[PDB]
Amino acid sequence: SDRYAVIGRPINHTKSPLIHGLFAQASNQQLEYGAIEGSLDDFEAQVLQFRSEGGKGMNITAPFKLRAFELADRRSERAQLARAANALKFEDGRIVAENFDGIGLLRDIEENLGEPLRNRRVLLLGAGGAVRGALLPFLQAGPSELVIANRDMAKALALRNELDHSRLRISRYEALEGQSFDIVVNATSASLTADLPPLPADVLGEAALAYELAYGKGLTPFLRLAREQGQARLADGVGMLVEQAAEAFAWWRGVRPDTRAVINQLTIPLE
């Protein structure tokens, strides 16, 4: 009945309709969740068309999250910091933008994987949109330190100044020499091209958790490095993907769907 959709380019292999369909059947919600191949030229017009046809909300994927952010009338705090929106809701009577990637990631780590950040040392690799979206929720969780390691230190410095939070620190990769962390999150795209971020491998020695944002891509070079260097539990981005979807589902429907079964079925065993 009520219609939702994901929009991005390419969209052929999106898991979003699958995920929200599973949510809908488990939670007894009558809705249809479709997929739209977004045009580089008229993305915005496509979003407006869907709304015009009675659509209730959308998820936004690459490469349109920034453009979704700009098109929106009202934007949540995480969306403003990321300058990127991965969910829209059409309510009396405009277009509201949210970004749930960071909340999904945090919930997967703290609840699903049993590693609350509170009072622990957390290293995030990268300073891209995913990292920007994760910063507020991660800091809200009170880690003893949150360290962003990145190649582009101007970008990382800009972020640190914007937040001015007592627990946030930035680092060059080389500078990580001799440092230890409890939770390490690889939010670079290295794993998508089966590559490895420039870590002194010893950085993973004390880790309880190495988390790869990439989904279903085998033992990435990062997770392999983690297994070599210590006894961290290894995870990829399947839980993040499902938890962020769930946040949007609750926003639209007022139901928090069970994510356990869904995460299980989409999980592609690393080992």
Q: Are residues 183 and 255 in the same domain?
A: no
Length of the chain: 271
Q: Are residues 98 and 34 in the same domain?
A: yes
Closest CA to 234 of 242, 225, 247, 244: 225
**Is 77 annotated to bind ligand?**
yes
Tokens of 264: 């299980």
Q: Which residues are catalytic?
A: 65
Q: Give me the residue label for tokens 């949150």.
A: 146
Are the CB atoms for 35 and 16 separated by under 8 Å?
Answer: yes
**Is 204 annotated to bind ligand?**
no
Are the CB atoms for 252 and 89 separated by under 8 Å?
Answer: yes
Q: Give me the residue label for tokens 């009396």.
A: 92
**Is 128 annotated to bind ligand?**
yes
Helix (H) / strand (E) containing 147: strand 145-149
The method of structure determination was X-ray
**Is 244 annotated to bind ligand?**
yes
Provide the resolution (angstroms): 1.7
The set of residues, in sequence order, having a beta carbon less than 8 Å from that of 222 and lying 6+ positions away, is: 125, 186, 190, 191, 196, 197, 199, 210, 212
* Cα 251 from chain centre: 17
| SS3 track for 179-216 | CCCCEEEECCCHHHHCCCCCCCHHHHCCCCEEEECCCC
Tokens of 133: 């979206």
Domain extent at residue 90: 1-114+237-271
Q: Are residues 122 and 217 in the same domain?
A: yes
Tokens of 71: 């098109």
Tokens of 13: 């292999």
Total domains, the chain: 2
Q: Are residues 159 and 87 in the same domain?
A: no
Q: Are residues 91 and 198 in the same domain?
A: no
Domain harbouring 101, CATH code:
3.40.50.10860
Closest CA to 230 of 269, 259, 203, 266: 203
The Cα–Cα gap between 87 and 89 comes to 7
CA angle 258, 82, 49 (to 5 degrees): 75
**Is 2 annotated to bind ligand?**
no
Q: Are residues 144 and 227 in the same domain?
A: yes
Question: Any idea of the CA torsion for 171, 176, 180, 181, to the nearest 10 degrees?
Answer: 40
The Cα–Cα gap between 125 and 189 comes to 10
Half-sphere exposure of 187 (CA within 13 A, CB side): 26
